[PDB]
């Protein structure tokens, strides 16, 4: 009258869940007055 | 008969690596081009 021992292992990686944000990095400002054509 | 040994999964919550590192985005040029001399 004995059942088994279903000690289900864990997940070696499991829900690591990397953010996967995706690179938005946007250095996008050289807008300092670039010598405007007003001379 | 006797108990068992571990092992199971199917899909233990797939997550996905991070997206990427900050790009250069849309680097600007300047406020206005043409000349820096006095108008």
């Amino acid at each position: 009258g004995a059942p088994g021992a279903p000690g289900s292992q864990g997940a070696p990686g499991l829900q690591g869940a990397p953010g996967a944000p995706g690179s938005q990095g946007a250095p996008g400002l050289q807008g300092a007055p670039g010598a405007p054509g007003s001379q | 008969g006797a108990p068992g040994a571990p092992g199971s999964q199917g899909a233990p919550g797939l997550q996905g690596a991070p997206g990427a590192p900050g790009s250069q985005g849309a680097p600007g040029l300047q406020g206005a081009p043409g000349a820096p001399g006095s108008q």
Partner: peptide
């Protein structure tokens, strides 16, 4: 540019 300098 041919000028502005």
């Amino acid at each position: 540019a041919p000028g502005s300098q």
